[PDB]
Design an enzyme around this catalytic site. Sequence first.
Site, PDB file in Angstrom:
ATOM      1  CG  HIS B 351      -1.928  -1.050   1.258  1.00  0.00           C
ATOM      2  ND1 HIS B 351      -3.213  -0.910   0.787  1.00  0.00           N
ATOM      3  CD2 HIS B 351      -1.835  -2.313   1.742  1.00  0.00           C
ATOM      4  CE1 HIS B 351      -3.874  -2.037   0.981  1.00  0.00           C
ATOM      5  NE2 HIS B 351      -3.057  -2.909   1.550  1.00  0.00           N
ATOM      6  CE  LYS B 542      -6.855  14.043   0.705  1.00  0.00           C
ATOM      7  NZ  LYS B 542      -6.743  12.950  -0.322  1.00  0.00           N
ATOM      8  NE  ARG B 543      -4.033  10.338  10.589  1.00  0.00           N
ATOM      9  CZ  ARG B 543      -3.766   9.414  11.499  1.00  0.00           C
ATOM     10  NH1 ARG B 543      -4.603   8.398  11.718  1.00  0.00           N
ATOM     11  NH2 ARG B 543      -2.667   9.518  12.207  1.00  0.00           N
ATOM     12  CE  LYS B 548      -2.522  10.908   3.386  1.00  0.00           C
ATOM     13  NZ  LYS B 548      -3.475  10.377   2.344  1.00  0.00           N
ATOM     14  CB  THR B 650     -10.192   4.911  -1.096  1.00  0.00           C
ATOM     15  OG1 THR B 650      -9.810   5.172   0.247  1.00  0.00           O
ATOM     16  CG2 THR B 650      -9.309   3.771  -1.609  1.00  0.00           C
ATOM     17  CE  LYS B 654     -13.781   6.710   1.259  1.00  0.00           C
ATOM     18  NZ  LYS B 654     -13.184   6.905   2.628  1.00  0.00           N
TER      19      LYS B 654
HETATM   20  O1  GPW Z   1      -0.058   3.099   6.836  1.00  0.00           O
HETATM   21  C1  GPW Z   1      -0.747   3.247   5.831  1.00  0.00           C
HETATM   22  N1  GPW Z   1      -1.963   3.967   5.930  1.00  0.00           N
HETATM   23  C2  GPW Z   1      -2.750   4.130   4.769  1.00  0.00           C
HETATM   24  O2  GPW Z   1      -3.811   4.762   4.822  1.00  0.00           O
HETATM   25  N2  GPW Z   1      -2.322   3.592   3.531  1.00  0.00           N
HETATM   26  C3  GPW Z   1      -3.176   3.818   2.320  1.00  0.00           C
HETATM   27  O3  GPW Z   1      -3.816   2.612   1.874  1.00  0.00           O
HETATM   28  C4  GPW Z   1      -4.861   2.881   0.932  1.00  0.00           C
HETATM   29  C5  GPW Z   1      -5.394   1.478   0.725  1.00  0.00           C
HETATM   30  O4  GPW Z   1      -5.046   0.934  -0.541  1.00  0.00           O
HETATM   31  C6  GPW Z   1      -4.379   3.674  -0.329  1.00  0.00           C
HETATM   32  O5  GPW Z   1      -5.502   4.137  -1.106  1.00  0.00           O
HETATM   33  C7  GPW Z   1      -3.509   4.897   0.034  1.00  0.00           C
HETATM   34  O6  GPW Z   1      -2.930   5.438  -1.169  1.00  0.00           O
HETATM   35  C8  GPW Z   1      -2.455   4.509   1.115  1.00  0.00           C
HETATM   36  O7  GPW Z   1      -1.673   5.639   1.569  1.00  0.00           O
HETATM   37  C9  GPW Z   1      -1.113   2.887   3.450  1.00  0.00           C
HETATM   38  C10 GPW Z   1      -0.322   2.709   4.597  1.00  0.00           C
HETATM   39  C11 GPW Z   1       0.982   1.874   4.490  1.00  0.00           C
HETATM   40  F1  GPW Z   1       2.078   2.569   4.653  1.00  0.00           F
HETATM   41  F2  GPW Z   1       1.013   1.256   3.335  1.00  0.00           F
HETATM   42  F3  GPW Z   1       0.948   0.891   5.390  1.00  0.00           F
END
Ligand code: GPW
Lengths: 810, 810
Positions: B351, B542-543, B548, B650, B654
């Site tokens: 991810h 978003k965070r 970002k 994501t 939305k």
């Molecule tokens: O710690 C996290 N927290 C997240 O929200 N994502 C997100 O994971 C989402 C799930 O696919 C993606 O849409 C986002 O681009 C991505 O930043 C990934 C990580 C990690 F670093 F890959 F673990």
Amino acid sequence: QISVRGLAGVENVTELKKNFNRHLHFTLVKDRNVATPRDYYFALAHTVRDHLVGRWIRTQQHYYEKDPKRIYYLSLEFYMGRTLQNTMVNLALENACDEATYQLGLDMEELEEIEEDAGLGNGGLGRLAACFLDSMATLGLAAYGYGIRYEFGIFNQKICGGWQMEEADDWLRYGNPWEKARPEFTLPVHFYGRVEHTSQGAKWVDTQVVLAMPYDTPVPGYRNNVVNTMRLWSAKAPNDFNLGYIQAVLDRNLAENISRVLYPNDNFFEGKELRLKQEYFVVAATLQDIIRRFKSSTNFDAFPDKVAIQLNDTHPSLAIPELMRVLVDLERLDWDKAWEVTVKTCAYTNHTVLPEALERWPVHLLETLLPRHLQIIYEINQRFLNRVAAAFPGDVDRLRRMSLVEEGAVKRINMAHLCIAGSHAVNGVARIHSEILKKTIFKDFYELEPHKFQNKTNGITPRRWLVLCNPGLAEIIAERIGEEYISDLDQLRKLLSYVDDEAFIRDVAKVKQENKLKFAAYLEREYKVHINPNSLFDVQVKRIHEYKRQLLNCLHVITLYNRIKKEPNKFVVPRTVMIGGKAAPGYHMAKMIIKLITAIGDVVNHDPVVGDRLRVIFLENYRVSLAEKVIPAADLSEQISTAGTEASGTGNMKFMLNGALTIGTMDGANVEMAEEAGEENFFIFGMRVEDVDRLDQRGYNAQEYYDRIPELRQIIEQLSSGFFSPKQPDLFKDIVNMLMHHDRFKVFADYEEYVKCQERVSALYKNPREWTRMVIRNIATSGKFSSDRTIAQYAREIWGVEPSRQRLPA
Amino acid sequence: QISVRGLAGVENVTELKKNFNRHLHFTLVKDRNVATPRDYYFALAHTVRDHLVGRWIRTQQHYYEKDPKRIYYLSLEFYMGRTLQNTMVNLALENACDEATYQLGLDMEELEEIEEDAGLGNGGLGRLAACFLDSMATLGLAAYGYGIRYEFGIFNQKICGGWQMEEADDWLRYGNPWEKARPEFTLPVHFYGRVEHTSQGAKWVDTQVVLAMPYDTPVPGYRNNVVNTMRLWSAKAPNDFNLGYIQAVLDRNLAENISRVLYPNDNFFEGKELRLKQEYFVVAATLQDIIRRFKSSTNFDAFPDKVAIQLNDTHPSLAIPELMRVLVDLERLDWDKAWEVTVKTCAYTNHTVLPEALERWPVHLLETLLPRHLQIIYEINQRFLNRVAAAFPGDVDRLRRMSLVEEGAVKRINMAHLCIAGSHAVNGVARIHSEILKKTIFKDFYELEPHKFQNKTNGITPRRWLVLCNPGLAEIIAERIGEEYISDLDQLRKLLSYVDDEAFIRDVAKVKQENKLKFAAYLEREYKVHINPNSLFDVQVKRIHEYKRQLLNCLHVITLYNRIKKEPNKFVVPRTVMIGGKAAPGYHMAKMIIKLITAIGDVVNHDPVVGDRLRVIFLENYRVSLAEKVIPAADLSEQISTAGTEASGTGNMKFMLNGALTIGTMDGANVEMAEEAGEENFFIFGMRVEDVDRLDQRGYNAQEYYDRIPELRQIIEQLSSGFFSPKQPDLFKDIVNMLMHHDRFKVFADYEEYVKCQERVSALYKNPREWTRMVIRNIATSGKFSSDRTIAQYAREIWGVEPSRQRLPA
Ligand SMILES: O=c1[nH]c(=O)n([C@@H]2O[C@H](CO)[C@@H](O)[C@H](O)[C@H]2O)cc1C(F)(F)F
Ligand SMILES: O=c1[nH]c(=O)n([C@@H]2O[C@H](CO)[C@@H](O)[C@H](O)[C@H]2O)cc1C(F)(F)F
């Protein structure tokens, strides 16, 4: 099947089963194929709890419309035990549920054994509280039990190599279907901070906040549709608590520790901070709940006409300075008026005279933790001492003896003194115990205010302690005299005209044989040990303590074993001796006593010469639901504390009620028991209180008994030489040592008269029919000892409310 | 009231109300007079949960009879949000409950606001998991979500003086009516100990035991009567744990800490022991549950035909050596066979590509905590490296680059490397992200095994993200094309033949005005702040993270404010800018960004010259149930990460689905979104991945942008001189500093093209009807981005199961 267990109507049975199936499906989310007996217990448990709620709601409403005076029973202990059977009993659902469950192809008794005890107490004092709540409901009093919802109750006892091992009693693991969490009535409790003085009086500031969340548990009265509430507080951290982020969250545990575990000492004071916090916690949260309920009816003159607070020993004694605090600092009443209200509201029950059991808090603890309450305590002391001085001028000694503040290396607050000053009634718990209070430790306080001191001899509930654990005996009693005695135990006296009835004699004796047969088969199934049920069942069950003289019992047992080995072909009346109870984890001597009892069993139980004429069993994990089994199966009840030490006793009363005879000393409620049955129907031995006093003046020298009694000399020689511990010959040097040089409880002085009395016991046992006629005389006179009588006395002579046996509507 | 919310039959409505009253009385033990809205939510919550259970039981049984292949989705995060509306939606009870509750004189929407979010995640990655589970149920897969039941979720965000304050999310305070505790499936998990070698292989001994207790939560599919299970483990101490007595009991907390709190970093690795324990905990307990279920159907050849394990990032990567462990040490399979089974069972989803976000555990941690797994890891590395060497002989560099073991000051295990070696499929989360994997960080692994690498572009669930939060739009869509698109979002494409329809244009625009009107009144009621609803709603939620580029947004906002103050009587299209999200407690820069955003608001929102042409709002406590409100009310969606950094996104999806237009860079799933709508219907700006690469080669010098752009120079001068922080002129020196010397994310390089693009956005907004026709073009093409498509791709191309849209019987 049996009469007293109520009706099993077609309509009730069909409704019960449909709700059982509804709960199994909707609540437990299981179906028949996957369910385990524990799912079955829960479905029945929810089904029964359904019958409570309507009544629970209607009782709380009745009390709001009618607004009577309310009784608040503050205790740090509520030894409830199991709830399902008791609930069925008091609702008359017992035979119905039995039928319903048998029809679903289940065994209801096997379901009952899956319920965990609520072991939120240590022994007599917590169990008094439980019996009291049952009696308060049955007698229609508007009463509330308040305490703490401990996450961990009295530890479970294991024996390993004959030693006690303690594991944690995780009684909430599977859920508690009886309680209802009520987070909407959460209340802040303050600790630490400091005191500021303003124009506008004192202010307590910079405090740490712990939240107290209540859980309510229904307490059904006996077949009268009253359902009262026991409210237990649980400790919660606030959300900005400390607010590493991670560590801040983890440290929320620090505050929630307050309600984590029950302190496991019986009749011993340990001065730990955690304990004092638990005491403050229950008092603070409970008082605000009380005041809030008073307000929803400005004027505190009527507060004592609407509120009664009973203090179960000194554990919740901070109620007194906390009520002054709220009244003086928050409601802005002047001192003297606040004090008048407090005194008229509070009453105090003493449960011991043992010096080591009295609570005496270090001033340096209260000062840090509760600095305002210390200020209030000093203020109470000053004003108290001015009354003493006015009434006994020049008596400087009396002044130091009565001070709430003890001087010395570390300053203490004598909490008993606090309760006497701030209560309108003080009571002991049996007649001899109340006199001792007036003659000895509270003598000075009695001279000042003779009017405060009363007696309220303890009692037990015949609902649990007869109907529930002993349906066999309840039933044969009912066949002759009717049901009415269940809430009016005096009626048992009518049994006295059946003492020469041949059919009743055989029935009383048959129930006793049945209970023994069933308990002996519990001892094989659950604990792989093999006892002859034709023996006399000689049982001592209660906490392990030096004053309870379990060791005296050990000495008797060794004596019998020695007399058997001396003349092996002589006839003795065969006995099964059973001794049970927990020792507090840090009470070394107590733990050694347990080791002795099993050691004796290791020798006696494997001697081929003994046969099965003598067996020694240590009854492991003693607790409320084990008491319900062993007590009905007993022939001999051992109540053998040194005279003057056992404030009252309640086990004594359980056995009397259940067809056991009593070997005992003239101690606590034993004295009134014998008085009620007549001394001829009782096995009384040993020193009276005055004899012990005579012995303290010239001094107790144990050597004299060792010197003049060969049978005893031999037992000590056996203990010392490693007869009972061959691999560690000096394992019992501590006990022999204590017995010989430091026995505060004069074990040897009673030994000779105890053994003699024990012989007279064996002699009556040889004649079954006279054994039983005497049993009948005991049961027939056991009425005084119903907690219904006790609570009616508290109500009329202390609380100012009239009891009532009238049903509320369905 | 509205079509898609289902039928409100007379029979259903009368049954709903009677069960509501049954729960209020029997379950909640309240009556109408004392109940508070929270009691009302719970009664409805239990009433709805009643409709699940039958289906829940029937689905678990169906899967036992039919024995299909099972999907296990291991995640450390499940960001569920609220459960009541979603449950009603998927059961078609929405209009019925609404009716029933209106008939009892209640407002159902006001009840819904009392439900706490289950915030068991941080953002996108936890929420992907939630959307996935919903899609897995709707598509009839036999799937289980496994994770940890944290006592405390993502902290609640407060702003105090424009700074973020974190308080603990005590989401379980009032009870969770959705979960069912299942203590009967409690399972031991081991930590520490050491490794012994015998004749009979390795043995892991002298371990500390932590118990894992499961709680099951129902996951209903969309109108097909499938109800799957999410199982979350909770940590419990054993009863002989440590077994001062008191302190032993208190220290039980140490072990139960494992499941206490969710770690609050998004896209950042912190190497703490507690975290690694949480990861081992969920993996160990889950694998035994999996193996146990496999056994109740000796032969592990069929294990991969019956089991699939999906690893949601590297968080549960220990699944790999844990499965080898159980197989090799406990089931006694030989290594090579065990390895074959593991590889065929496990698959891994990456991810991120941010170096700081990759998990890389110190060898000294694993060695102490999990010494056997270290042994297994080394063994895996050796055998892996021999394959690399065989295929690329002499390439010593490749060997060190691919090692699972990184050398250096402290040895680390690269967990990503572990997952690639031991999985049969590895996927990124949008098409550009998957290519980057193959071209950059996993290039060496791709050359070795090209066949493992796939793509599975993310999706969101149209059930929550359209039907639930946006009934207005769902309904007008349904009026023209029918209901079918709810589980087949491609159908939205039929909307394209309505792009010139005047009646549809007005309806799309009216729903959007309604959502804005309602959200503006949420902003006044719950947060006392006053916005003009005729403005363009420009939102970035978003965070908070540097990648970002919230700061880029700040720079735009300041620019607009400056242009207004330069020519105050010039017409601008009025905007409400909303920016929201949490910062991780230790992420200093992130927390400073939040302070900047409110500081800008403090200046902009009180300038009389600005009027209400510009407002800056920081949206406090962003979370799932706040997303459901703001997202429907948005006109502009900000997706402005530096190219190459946002794996997929994501939120982007939305907003597209809910009638917002997108200003964004060519990053992650933005790329396929524009491709699907056509680039003309999208506001695309700034560097592409290759442009960023070009800039890294010659080097990023921010001074150049500061030098050539007067509008930007002025913003930096304002930041530096204390314009936004008059009382602390140097409050923002850190940000200005980072922007000028250490910006890893090239904020200035995109600034000029961003502002230009922003102008084109304002220009379309001036023409309502063309704004809306473009909205229609977006919504009409948003189908690809349904998690139904994503999961169908996982199922066919990774798990080897055929989805199914066929209903199970009622
Ligand atoms: O710690 C996290 N927290 C997240 O929200 N994502 C997100 O994971 C989402 C799930 O696919 C993606 O849409 C986002 O681009 C991505 O930043 C990934 C990580 C990690 F670093 F890959 F673990
Ligand atoms: O700590 C205790 N634990 C008890 O079981 N009791 C018992 O309390 C019972 C309740 O009245 C009496 O029957 C017993 O004689 C008495 O020993 C008293 C104390 C305490 F010391 F008074 F506090």
